[PDB]
């Protein structure tokens, strides 16, 4: 019932020899605890890890508390620090109570920014740039929802937090031929630094829409109204250093008009595959939002959104509400689908573009494009999915921007998968340097580890042997630098009563500012479990975990 699990060992280049001596405590039903001494030899100490899993009427939750009283390596790298202790607190709760109450907690807090580069990555990763601390309580019924939440972030590499944020949604569907809804928000923005601006924002957004449909066509007209009020304080330091002055009280009022239309054509694929059907779906959307000068409002939670094919028909250029770009545009796209004789969709391909009649402006336009294009067909997007057979599949997408004068981003993947144990996958990701310069901070464009963009080729494979052995491998490689990014091997032997898996991983683990090269971490560890072949668990163990693409 409650006792000692099998101890497990590892060898990493970060802590040398690592030993784990877990102890399981079944406190009650819906209450488990796990106390793990974790001896690290390079740091010469024992980290105490405490996991607590609970189930209650409010939902399911898991807490984790890791505490290392002292650290020799951290002491050597920080000889002027008062204490070398490290710790991590994690709490994940999710629940819906009585179908109306929704409780969510996603809280991570570490003692220092270098925690995930030095310790196991169970609830965090070394690829993470920050830790999220979110609380949320919501009340949701069929035509109403009201949520109060808090969002804070611990950056590892000044951050704004919503303390608190309140969102309200109301819906009413049968007001004559019109559907109506109203959205409201009230947020308080606070910064970690004491010299940055603080804000209180209140936003109202009533929307009305007339939908119309046929068997072949559909058209939706929508009129939306946006009214935002900003009260800004602590503007002295910012206003003393910037030629553009922030305003203490701001009112931003703007309407939005949108028209969306879709058509569907069908035909029979007589020549290629009798019984197969091909559908052609043209879609158009006109969007108008008048220009409002928003340079006097600080940007707290608005970021530029990626524009894939589905994002072409989005009505917003930025997230949040601090920046709302003016729009006078028409988005046109076409999607072709191929269904088999059983009415199952085997193929789809979509291509679309956005045409701007006027420049999209927010009053603060600091993004660095490669050219001064303002109007015309500036954004193109394409996507494709092909289920070649029951075991073969290929996905792909591309995003091109003329203002970059380059392909913005692209991704592709081809996967064979006979079952959960037998699979191969090849994937490619690309992000151009121009996109990195445009959509990211300036030091990203000037830094060696950021400026070249992304050109990454990944290969994953998994094969069973003899119905008791499973071998899994992964290799992710960067073509720009011609250097390895990630590599993983794992072999597991599964029996009736027990399973033994041994895994190896080499990963990028940081950057060395002195000699200007990436740091690599190697880890080889064994694990024994008391008793599938564990292929899927091994495939999710590296910093670039496997995801099924059919």
């Amino acid at each position: 019932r409650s006792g000692f699990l099998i101890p497990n060992a590892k060898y990493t280049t970060t802590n040398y020899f690592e030993f784990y001596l877990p102890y399981y405590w079944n406190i009650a039903p819906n209450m488990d605890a796990t106390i793990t001494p974790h001896y690290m030899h390079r740091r010469g100490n024992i980290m105490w890890e405490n996991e607590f899993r609970y189930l209650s009427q409010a939902g399911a939750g898991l807490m984790e508390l890791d505490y290392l009283p002292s650290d020799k390596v951290y002491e050597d790298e920080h000889p002027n620090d008062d204490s070398s202790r490290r710790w991590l607190f994690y709490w994940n709760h999710s629940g819906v109570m009585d179908q109306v109450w929704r409780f969510n907690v996603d809280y991570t807090k570490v003692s220092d920014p270098s925690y995930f580069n030095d310790f196991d990555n169970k609830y965090g990763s070394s690829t993470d740039g920050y830790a999220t601390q979110k609380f949320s309580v919501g009340y949701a019924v069929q035509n109403f929802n009201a949520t109060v939440s808090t969002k804070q972030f611990q950056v590892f590499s000044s951050s704004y937090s919503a303390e608190p944020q309140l969102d309200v949604n109301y819906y009413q569907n049968d007001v004559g031929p019109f559907d109506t809804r109203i959205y409201g928000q009230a947020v308080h923005f606070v910064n970690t630094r004491d010299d940055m601006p603080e804000a209180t924002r209140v936003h109202l957004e009533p929307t009305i829409n007339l939908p119309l449909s046929n068997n072949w066509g559909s058209i939706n007209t929508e009129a939306k109204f946006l009214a935002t009020h900003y009260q800004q304080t602590n503007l002295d330091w910012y206003n003393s250093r910037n030629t553009t002055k922030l305003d203490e009280s701001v009112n931003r009022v703007m309407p939005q008009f949108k028209v969306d239309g879709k058509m569907v054509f069908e035909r029979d694929m007589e020549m290629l595959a009798p019984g197969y059907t091909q559908t052609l779906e043209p879609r158009a959307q006109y969007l108008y939002v008048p220009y409002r000068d928003q340079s006097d409002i600080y940007n707290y939670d608005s970021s530029l959104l990626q524009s894939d094919y589905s994002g072409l028909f989005r009505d917003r250029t930025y997230g949040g509400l601090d920046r709302i770009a003016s729009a006078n545009q028409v988005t046109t796209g076409v999607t072709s689908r191929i269904y088999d004789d059983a009415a199952v969709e085997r193929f789809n391909i979509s291509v679309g573009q956005i045409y701007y009649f006027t420049e999209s402006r927010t009053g603060d336009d600091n993004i660095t494009w490669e050219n001064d294009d303002k109007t015309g067909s500036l954004v193109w997007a394409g996507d494709t999915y092909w289920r070649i057979s029951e075991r073969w599949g290929l996905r792909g997408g591309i995003q091109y921007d003329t203002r970059l004068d380059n392909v913005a981003t692209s991704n592709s993947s081809i996967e064979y998968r006979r079952d959960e144990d037998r699979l191969v996958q090849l994937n490619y990701h690309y992000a151009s340097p121009e996109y990195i310069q445009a959509t990211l901070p300036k030091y990203y464009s000037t830094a060696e580890q950021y400026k070249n963009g992304i050109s990454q080729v990944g290969a994953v494979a998994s094969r069973p042997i003899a119905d008791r052995w499973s071998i899994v491998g992964a290799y992710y490689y960067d073509t720009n630098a011609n250097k390895q990014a990630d590599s993983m091997l794992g072999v597991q032997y599964s029996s009736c009563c027990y399973a033994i898996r041994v895994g190896y991983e080499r990963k990028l683990n940081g950057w060395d500012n002195d000699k200007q090269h990436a740091v690599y971490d190697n880890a080889i560890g064994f694990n024994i479990e008391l008793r599938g072949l564990g292929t899927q668990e091994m495939l999710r163990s590296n910093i670039l975990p496997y995801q099924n693409t059919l």
Partner: peptide
Amino acid sequence: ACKWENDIWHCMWMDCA
């Protein structure tokens, strides 16, 4: 800041300088 003129409907849909 500023105050809307008499023609609120036309002024709501115009652009900003």
